[PDB]
Amino acid sequence: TLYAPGGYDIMGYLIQIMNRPNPQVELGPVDTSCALILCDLKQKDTPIVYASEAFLYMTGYSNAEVLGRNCRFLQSPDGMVKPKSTRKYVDSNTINTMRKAIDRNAEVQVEVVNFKKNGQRFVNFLTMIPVRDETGEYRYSMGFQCE
Numbered sequence: 001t002l003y004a005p006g007g008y009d010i011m012g013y014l015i016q017i018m019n020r021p022n023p024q025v026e027l028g029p030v031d032t033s034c035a036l037i038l039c040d041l042k043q044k045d046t047p048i049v050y051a052s053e054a055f056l057y058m059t060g061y062s063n064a065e066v067l068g069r070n071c072r073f074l075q076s077p078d079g080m081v082k083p084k085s086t087r088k089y090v091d092s093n094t095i096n097t098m099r100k101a102i103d104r105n106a107e108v109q110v111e112v113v114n115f116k117k118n119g120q121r122f123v124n125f126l127t128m129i130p131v132r133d134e135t136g137e138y139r140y141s142m143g144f145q146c147e
């Protein structure tokens with residue numbers, strides 16, 4: 001996975017999200033002190049390109065451990081999850097709901113069982129919102145995690 005030199009406009013994307021004209025989900029106000037990640041929709045398998053400190057701390061993973069991976073690794077206490085695999089700890093419909101939303105650039109909000117690096121189970125109230133870059137096309141997805 002490639003990462004933008006000098007980083008991502010996380011604050012600008014938060015503002016874009018808070019200002020979005022027809023919010024389909026209730027997110028409320030958010031900021032950089034929240035558990036959030038940004039994933040790149042135009043790299044293979046939608047890799048994490050940015051993780052906030054609060055995400056790293058909620059999950060127990062380091063920046064080196066998370067960047068460049070699809071976030072589905074959180075769905076197993078091993079951190080090992082193949083795409084299209086049936087999940088042991090998440091129901092199929094929730095997984096499919098997330099995938100379809102992301103593919104359609106549709107906002108979605110789910111509750112999913114996730115696991116910290118130490119294997120501790122937690123319930124993740126997850127909101128994903130697509131984000132337009134400077135071209136005006138949907139390029140990223142910003143995910144907001146709550147425990």
Ligand SMILES: Cc1cc2nc3c(=O)[nH]c(=O)nc-3n(C[C@H](O)[C@H](O)[C@H](O)COP(=O)(O)O)c2cc1C
Nearest residue numbers: 039070071072074083095098099112141142143145
């Ligand atoms: C911005 C963003 C944040 C995500 N955060 C999480 C998360 O915290 N936990 C999780 O279980 N899945 C998360 N996902 C969902 C998975 O990465 C993946 O999209 C989901 O498993 C459905 O796709 P799949 O069928 O390829 O696995 C996130 C996805 C995106 C794009």
